[PDB]
Structures are given as C-alpha cells and as structure tokens.
Design a protein around this ligand. Structure first.
Ligand SMILES: NC(=O)C1=CN([C@@H]2O[C@H](COP(=O)(O)OP(=O)(O)OC[C@H]3O[C@@H](n4cnc5c(N)ncnc54)[C@H](OP(=O)(O)O)[C@@H]3O)[C@@H](O)[C@H]2O)C=CC1
Ligand SMILES: COc1ccc(Oc2cccc3nc(N)nc(N)c23)cc1
Length: 192
C-alpha cells in the first residue's frame, strides 16, 4: 500500500488529555470499547479489512489468548523488529511506512496506541485524521494518570458531527454518553 491516509483513534480525559495509568486505561467505558471495535472493524469495500497499528508494549499487554485482535490485520512496531509477515493477521515492522509496504486489500489504517506510538506518530504526515473520544469528569484531578497526549492541536481543526458521521458510516453515534461519573463524545479532527 503506498502512502495511505492513516487515522489515530484514542480516548482521552479533558482537560489534560490523560490516557493511562501504570500501563492501563484509567476507566472502563463499555459503550466506548464497542465503538472502538465497530469503527476499527467495519469496511465498505468487499474483500477488504482494516489494519490496526500498535506499539510492542501494547501488544504484550493483550492476554495471549486474545491476540491478535480479530477481524483486522494487526501490525506491531518495535525498533528491534525485522519487516516480516508472521501470518495473514500479524505483521512485524520497525516503521509505519515499512509495515504498509507489506499489506494489500486494506481499506483503512488506524493507530491504536500506546502513548509512545501516539506522541511520535502524530508528527508523521501520513496521519490525516484523529478520532478522539473526549471524556469529561466533574473532578478530573481525582483520577490518577501518568501518561498524556502531547498533540499539537493548534495545527488541527475539530470537524462538525456531520463529518464524523460520514467517516464512520452506519455506526451509531450517541451524544453525551454517561457511564458512572464520566460523560463522553466522539470527535473527528483534520489538519489545517
Ligand atoms: N487512552 C487510550 O485510548 C489508550 C491508552 N493507551 C495507554 O498507553 C500506555 C502504554 O503506552 P506505552 O507504554 O508508551 O506503549 P506503546 O504501545 O506505545 O509501545 C512503545 C513501544 O513501541 C515501539 N515503538 C514506539 N515508538 C516507535 C516508533 N516510532 N517506531 C518503532 N517502534 C516504536 C517501541 O518498541 P521497542 O521497545 O521494542 O523498540 C516502544 O518501546 C498505557 O497506559 C495504555 O493504557 C494505549 C492505547 C489506547
Ligand atoms: C492492551 O491492548 C490494547 C489497549 C488499548 C487499545 O485501544 C483501545 C482500547 C479500548 C478502547 C479504545 N477507545 C479508543 N477510542 N481508542 C483506543 N485506541 C481504544 C487497544 C488494545
């Protein structure tokens, strides 16, 4: 695949954009996990699938029985990896671009974490869209977090809900979803 558009998908707590604590997500939002699954799996074209890219630490954090993530081509980056196809669902690479040279029949590509991957790849011009779930809490300071997005958002534009809707196709997008004390909304951002 040559120079595909790539999207980042992440869930973050406003206003600091925290995304983790001691190697895990600081919340369990059930409807948000379901959204992540639908957006990253669904395709429109026939014989295609989407690819998900993750850092080695994220891959190793999935219980072995639950990997690879089903119904998507899994790409794992490590600076120590050779560019290799493991099987039809797993690719190892040391760079995003190298990895995409190994794929065919992919419709969309999503970066799914973690923090080091996000913070480095935001500055790669292949990244064209950010799917950020903006999480809000009455007392964000009470939530322990050690990992944060370092995104240059002054260079990106938040689009209207209509644009997100068109991006995700059929997926149901509810507004101000509440689970416990958290309220969240799905957003789409593109480069200015
Ligand atoms: N809020 C959310 O939506 C999500 C949050 N997260 C959070 O992220 C945190 C984990 O992040 P982190 O520990 O940084 O792990 P990562 O998944 O980002 O893995 C980092 C590893 O990826 C490899 N790597 C990183 N950057 C590159 C690069 N530019 N090119 C090639 N290889 C690269 C390296 O592997 P090597 O060391 O082998 O070279 C590096 O050690 C957790 O707290 C998790 O909960 C994760 C996903 C989503
Ligand atoms: C440990 O394995 C993983 C950890 C996190 C992960 O990414 C997510 C998991 C669950 C919900 C998620 N929601 C959004 N908006 N973005 C992500 N990247 C998500 C995917 C795999």
């Amino acid at each position: 695949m040559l120079k595909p558009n790539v999207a980042i998908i992440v869930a973050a707590l406003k206003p600091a954009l925290g995304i983790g604590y001691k190697g895990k997500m600081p919340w369990r939002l059930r409807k948000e996990i379901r959204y992540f699954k639908d957006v990253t799996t669904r395709t429109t074209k026939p014989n295609t699938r989407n690819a998900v890219i993750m850092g080695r630490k994220t891959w190793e954090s999935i219980p072995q029985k639950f990997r690879p993530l089903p119904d998507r081509l899994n790409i794992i980056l490590s600076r120590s990896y050779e560019n290799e196809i493991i099987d039809d669902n797993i690719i190892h690479a040391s760079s995003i671009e190298s990895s995409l040279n190994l794929v065919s029949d992919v419709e969309r590509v999503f970066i799914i974490g973690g923090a080091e991957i996000y913070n480095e790849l935001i500055n790669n011009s292949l990244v064209s869209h950010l799917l950020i779930t903006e999480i809000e809490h009455p007392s964000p300071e009470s939530i322990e977090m050690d990992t944060f997005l370092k995104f240059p958002l002054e260079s990106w534009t938040k689009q209207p809900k209509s644009e997100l809707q068109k991006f995700v196709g059929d997926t149901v997008l509810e507004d101000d979803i509440k689970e416990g004390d958290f309220t969240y909304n799905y957003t789409l951002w593109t480069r200015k």
